[PDB]
């Protein structure tokens, strides 16, 4: 029973991962072949940069503005910066913008979304000059709409790139996210890779590799069939016509009679997919963004992401059939995620109830082997030995995301603190109780048993490997070898400031 269950789980997970790797490799080969035919100094299309931020650290905002200004693309109509400010404490963003760009900063007293006239000509009169807009605090949803309105002033603009206030762009980042748009007429959105730059925390160290693996496996597999459901907040590209078409549904959302605030990126990709358009993700575009270093903040972010995903999965399933043959892979991936979550929950419950040492050791060994294979693949792809630290991802995943998904499911249908971390605390207490029950029930020692010694040796080897990994990470932290090259430059610049 249990042997068959874990064997089937491991076989299916390995097969799906291998298929995703093959799909990502094929997509990368296709993108490389497309790029190989790109003429030198390609600037046929016109792009506009839209940046939105709120309560951003001054150094991060300045570095993002400098990185955007350092782009080597020779066809940029204008730079649009929309900040949900209109407050005394929000004037720092405008002051920083004036130090890096022109002083043409406007502070309209009305919001375009809430105004009877949605055209931006009432608040802006010049297109050639860069403009900064300060608006009352309404959310990221309203900030993007202002940029979209300001980017539709002239017909010359054919595409726009959305950049977060904490995103550091490469020299050719803009070109790599606009080139695939012209490759195929059906392509309307382009996804860019996002990489975590700070690795000074054990949580951030695992988050960086999780982001790398996600972007280079799942996004590539989705883009092979052109069914990407998330273009990426820090780095993403869109076409002007599809935005003009889907602006109204994206602002007039109605789920259960209340306007939604989360799901800023997933909903836009879902709206793009509902029109039958194709989205292609490219890995040659590199974007750097920060990651939270607090367990509670990471749990809250994961809960919000799970809420957005479970809200948008119904729309994804309902719109997948509009692509004909395409979308079958997307539906299969959604079903895979749902069945994987249910199977993980069922397996955990079965292990907790039975508390059999033989099943526990086998499951731990299978999970460790799968994670080791994934880490080896990541190291081979990234050509870096730091990918082997992904073996510690299982602990943080189990202790953070599962309660986050539980909370997301429960919230669909003192008090504020209970709504956030009480479920996580209950999950931790239940896990501890299950572990105590398992240890107490099997409180015996029999060195004459083949199976008992096998389980003991397996658990001892697992503990030794975990201890070795933690010791290696601690040694690397002191030596600061795990620090990314970009992080060191930022630290030096902050010191010399």
């Amino acid at each position, epitope marked *: 029973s249990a042997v068959w269950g874990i064997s089937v789980y491991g076989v299916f997970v390995l097969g799906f991962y291998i298929a995703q790797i093959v799909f990502s490799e094929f997509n990368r080969m296709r993108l490389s072949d497309w790029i190989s035919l790109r003429p030198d*100094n390609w600037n046929a299309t016109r792009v506009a940069v839209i940046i939105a931020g709120y309560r951003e650290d001054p150094f991060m905002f300045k570095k993002c503005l400098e990185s955007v200004r350092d782009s*080597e693309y020779g066809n940029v109509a*204008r730079l649009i910066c929309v900040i949900d400010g209109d407050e005394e404490e929000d004037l720092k963003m405008a002051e920083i913008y004036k130090q*890096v760009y022109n002083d043409n900063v406007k502070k309209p007293g009305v919001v375009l979304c809430e105004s009877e006239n949605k055209n931006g000509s009432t608040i802006d009169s010049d297109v*050639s000059k860069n403009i900064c807009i300060l608006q009352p605090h309404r959310g990221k949803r309203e900030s993007l709409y202002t940029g979209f309105q300001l980017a539709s002033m002239d017909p010359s603009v054919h595409a726009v790139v959305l950049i977060d206030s904490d995103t550091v762009l490469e020299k050719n980042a803009i070109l790599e996210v606009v080139y695939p748009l012209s490759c195929d007429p059906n392509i309307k959105a382009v996804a860019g890779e996002c990489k975590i730059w700070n690795t000074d925390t054990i949580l951030s160290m695992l988050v960086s590799w999780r982001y790398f693996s996600a972007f280079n496996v799942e996004r590539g597999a989705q883009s092979l069939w052109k069914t990407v459901q998330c273009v990426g907040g820090p780095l993403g590209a869109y076409t002007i016509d599809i935005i003009n078409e889907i602006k109204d549904p994206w602002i007039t959302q109605t789920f259960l009679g209340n306007k939604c605030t989360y799901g800023d990126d997933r909903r836009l990709t879902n709206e793009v997919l509902m029109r039958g358009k194709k989205i292609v993700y490219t890995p040659f575009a590199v974007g750097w963004s920060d990651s939270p270093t607090n367990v509670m903040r990471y749990i809250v972010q994961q809960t919000r992401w799970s809420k957005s995903w479970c809200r948008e999965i119904w729309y994804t399933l309902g719109s997948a059939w509009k692509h004909g043959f395409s979308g079958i892979y997307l539906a299969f991936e959604c079903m895979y995620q749902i069945m994987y979550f249910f199977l993980v929950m069922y397996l955990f419950s079965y292990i907790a109830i039975k508390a059999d040492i033989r099943a526990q050791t086998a499951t731990v060994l299978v999970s460790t082997l799968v994670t080791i294979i994934k880490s080896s693949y990541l190291a081979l792809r990234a050509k870096n030995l730091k990918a082997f630290y992904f073996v510690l991802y299982t602990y943080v995943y189990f202790f953070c995301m599962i309660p986050a998904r539980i909370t997301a499911m429960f919230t669909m249908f003192v008090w504020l603190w209970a709504k956030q971390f009480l479920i996580t605390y209950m999950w931790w207490a239940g896990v501890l109780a299950a572990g105590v029950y398992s240890i107490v029930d099997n409180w015996y020692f029999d060195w004459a048993d083949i199976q008992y010694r096998f389980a003991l040796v397996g658990i001892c080897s697992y503990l030794v490997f975990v201890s070795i990994v933690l010791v290696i990470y601690l040694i690397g932290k002191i030596t600061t070898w795990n620090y990314t090259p970009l992080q060191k430059e930022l630290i030096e610049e902050r010191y010399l400031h």
Partner: nanobody
Amino acid sequence: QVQLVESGGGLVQAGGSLRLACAASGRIFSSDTLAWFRRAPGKEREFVAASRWSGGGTDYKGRFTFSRDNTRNTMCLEMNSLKPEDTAVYYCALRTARDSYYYTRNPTGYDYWGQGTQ
């Protein structure tokens, strides 16, 4: 912010060649464009050539070539087959993209000017 220092000059007959070199003390930001302007005596400055730091190039011709080192923050404007009317007072200028990204040949847009080389 950015100071432009350039050297070179002298008296050269109609048959020969000479080399320019403009050095910038600052950050180019990989988007600013720099142009060379020459001013004949009793005349206003006229456009000669320009090119963005990232790449590209604009002339007027083909008689004058523009090259950028992109490593030592220096660029050169090699010229050949000089003419009696070619000689003038050359200037090195920089254009900032903060105001707008549009490229223009108007000397008024340029702010970080240099000096003469003849």
